[PDB]
């Protein structure tokens, strides 16, 4: 297996491009979900009241800002666009965002399902 470092090189989003904000949004969200998965698995059995209440708060604010941002941004870019490159980027953008969205939702549900103090 090849495990290499992956850090956003283009942080400065001055241009504030549509795809730029979208990619950054889906990237951050996805990452958080991947890392959150672990806590969810451990919390599933641990059933820790503190760990749960915490994950819920973090997952709430994350899924919230992501849902709102993604929805708005997506609705913005969806306004008008037609091109090979634009189509490709747009396709992958919605693909990654959609995936992270489903996973995130599932995680939240599970957390809420687990009974704790």
Swiss-Prot record:
Coiled coil: 1-96
GO BP term, pick one: protein homotrimerization
Tissue-by-tissue expression: Midgut and hindgut contents as well as fecal pellets (at protein level).
A Pfam family per the record: Blo-t-5
GO molecular function, one term: protein homodimerization activity
InterPro entries: Mite_allergen_group-5/21 (IPR020306), Mite_allergen_group-5/21_sf (IPR038455)
Annotated keywords: Allergen, Coiled coil, Signal
Keyword Coiled coil carried by entry: yes
Keyword Plastid: no
Assembly notes: May exist as homodimer and homotrimer.
Family: Belongs to the mite group 5 allergen family.
Name assigned to this protein: Mite allergen Blo t 5
Annotated source species: Blomia tropicalis
């Amino acid at each position: 297996q090849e495990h290499k470092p992956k850090k956003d090189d283009f942080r400065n989003e001055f241009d504030h491009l549509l795809i730029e904000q979208a990619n950054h949004a889906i990237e951050k969200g996805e990452h958080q979900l991947l890392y959150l998965q672990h806590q969810l698995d451990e919390l599933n059995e641990n059933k820790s009241k503190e760990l749960q209440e915490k994950i819920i708060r973090e997952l709430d604010v994350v899924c919230a800002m992501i849902e709102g941002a993604q929805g708005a941004l997506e609705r913005e870019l969806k306004r008008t666009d037609l091109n090979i490159l634009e189509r490709f980027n747009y396709e992958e953008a919605q693909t990654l965002s959609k995936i992270l969205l489903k996973d995130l939702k599932e995680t939240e549900q599970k957390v809420k399902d687990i009974q704790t103090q």
